[PDB]
Amino acid sequence: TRLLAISPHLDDAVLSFGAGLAQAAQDGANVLVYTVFAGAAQPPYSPAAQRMHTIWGLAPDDDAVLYRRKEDIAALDHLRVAHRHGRFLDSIYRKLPDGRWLTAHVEGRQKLAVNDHSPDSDHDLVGEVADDIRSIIDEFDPTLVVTCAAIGEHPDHEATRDAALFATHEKNVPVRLWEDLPYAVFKSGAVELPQGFRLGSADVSSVKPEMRSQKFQAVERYSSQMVLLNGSENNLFDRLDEHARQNAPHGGYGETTWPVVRSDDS
Ligand SMILES: [Zn+2]
Ligand SMILES: [Zn+2]
Ligand SMILES: [Zn+2]
């Protein structure tokens, strides 16, 4: 078994599929967690990025990507799985063709506003990510790829998922999508895949209690994210535990995945 996980951001694979990754390595699978939006960003940073860096507990002009890469290595080391950090710049570091920042701040609103941009610019981003994924597939030779469903409709999650779907289709590798966490605790669960792809029936895994514990310890390595993840009530793990409790109310901890298959008549 050669499992390639494709995470949009530094933390998504561990939050959503950490237990499955740790279980996979335990069973003797070769596991690799490649993160798409891990590109090394250079100053000058935008105001919106600077603000994010402060929310992550960093100085505005700190090398934030380096810090987050280090956290990611620690967390994946904890699950006993390998890492690979991609070249793509996260949303807060990207500029548009016209020279504007992709993301700007508004006064008095929590979530950052994304500037409108061309379908061409999205097609091109997704194309480049797909290119990188295809090469990784050639290099690593996965038997299975797992990536995000993009529940919550984060644009970087959709870009990652879509590129993985195009690349895995061309390369004939089976692909599964994980339920995005903690997004799925806050957002419905229905997603729109690119034309020609659809979701098969869900599978909610059964993991040993010790893999649950390892997952949550791995999550704790993302120190920069604890404020963003614990939110208001400081109860991320409670919410994660409660979610898994529902989806197996006669079992313990587990993670929801769906296989991706071709639609009929496509
Ligand atoms: Zn993410
Ligand atoms: Zn490394
Ligand atoms: Zn992003």
Ligand SMILES: [Zn+2]
């Ligand atoms: Zn876009």
Ligand SMILES: [Zn+2]
């Ligand atoms: Zn769910």
